[PDB]
């Protein structure tokens, strides 16, 4: 998917000087490139950056919303500590069944707990937990319509100092539309405007893939 709004020629170069995916990440991405939905997955550049954040941050407790075939979860899982844990939320049983196949295949399935079913229902159960779980990092990358909800609910399930990571903030450049007619564009426009003055977090909008925002909880 390259980089939204980035020069095609400069993106090719950026790729030239970027790191290849490890074996199983590359394999997962390579073997499923044919199946529909593959374009929804984060780019290889985002996966590398994502794994770099798990390491740099020291994260052990991760919460992913929007799993699909497990590519992003796998990227992070490969950098988790021996006691690292990922709670993966996804509504699709078929794509997620493929995710499970590759996680166990890479030996990180032990560090990933898939929660099949609507993400909101799962978040509600997490907040209803005794004691209240608190993740070091949360990756929001599912249905855009519910981003405001996932951010808010996840923000209280995030430790102070934790990092929220949201994908698709530049939404194919549609965010520049004056009167957006598409629902996801409208929801993302308001989401970005709201987050730009959310004084509970210190943010950084990064142009990798379809745009990703890093929100560090104060």
Ligand X SMILES: COc1cc(/C=C/C(=O)O)ccc1O
Residues that bind ligand SAH (CB under 6 A): 40-42, 66-68, 71-72, 89-92, 95, 118-119, 141-143
Q: Are 119 and 63 in contact (CB under 8 A)?
A: no
Q: Which stretch binds Mg ion (CB under 5 A): 7-15, 23-31, 144-152, 161-169?
A: 161-169
Instruction: Give the one residue of 39, 58, 82, 129 binding ligand X; rule: CB under 6 A.
Output: 39
Q: Counting contacts by CB under 8 A, is residue 202 touching a copy of itself?
A: yes
Tell me how far apart the alpha carbons of residues 203 and 199 are, in angstroms, rounded to a whole number. Answer: 10
Compute the C-alpha angle 119/123/125, nearest 5°. Answer: 120
Q: By C-beta, is 11 or 143 nearer to a copy of itself?
A: 11
Query: Is 194 marked as a binding-site residue?
Result: no
Number of residues that bind a copy of itself (CB under 8 A): 46
Q: Counting contacts by CB under 8 A, is residue 155 touching a copy of itself?
A: no
Query: Is 72 marked as a binding-site residue?
Result: yes
Q: How many CB atoms lie within 10 A of CB 159?
A: 14
Q: What is the DSSP letter of 200?
A: T
Q: Counting contacts by CB under 5 A, is residue 213 touching Mg ion?
A: no
Tell me how far apart the alpha carbons of residues 52 and 143 are, in angstroms, rounded to a whole number. Answer: 25
Q: For residue 205, list its beta bridge partners.
A: 213
Tell me how far apart the alpha carbons of residues 47 and 215 are, in angstroms, rounded to a whole number. Answer: 17
Which residues bind to ligand X, rule: CB under 6 A? 39-40, 66, 141, 167-168
Annotated binding-site residues for S-adenosyl-L-homocysteine read 42, 72, 90, 119, 143
């Amino acid at each position: 998917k390259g980089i939204t709004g980035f020069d095609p020629s400069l993106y090719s170069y950026l790729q030239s000087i970027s790191a290849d995916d490890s074996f199983y990440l590359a394999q997962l991405r390579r073997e499923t490139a044919h199946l529909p939905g593959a374009p929804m997955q984060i780019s290889p550049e985002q996966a590398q950056f994502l794994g770099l954040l798990i390491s740099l941050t020291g994260a052990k407790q991760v919460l992913e919303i929007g799993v699909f075939r497990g590519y992003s979860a796998l990227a992070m899982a490969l950098q988790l500590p021996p006691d690292g844990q990922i709670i993966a939320c996804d509504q699709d049983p078929n794509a997620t069944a493929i995710a499970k196949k590759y996680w166990q295949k890479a030996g990180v399935a032990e560090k990933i707990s898939l929660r099949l079913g609507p993400a909101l229902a799962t978040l509600e159960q997490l907040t209803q937990g005794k004691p209240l779980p608190e993740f070091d990092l949360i990756f929001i990358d599912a249905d855009k319509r519910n981003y405001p909800r996932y951010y808010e609910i996840g923000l209280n399930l995030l430790r102070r100092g934790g990092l929220m990571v949201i994908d698709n903030v530049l939404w194919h450049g549609k965010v520049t539309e004056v009167d957006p007619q598409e629902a996801q564009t409208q929801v993302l426009q308001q989401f970005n405007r709201d987050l730009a003055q959310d004084e509970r977090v210190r943010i950084s909008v990064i142009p990798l893939g379809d745009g990703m925002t890093l929100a560090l909880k104060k």
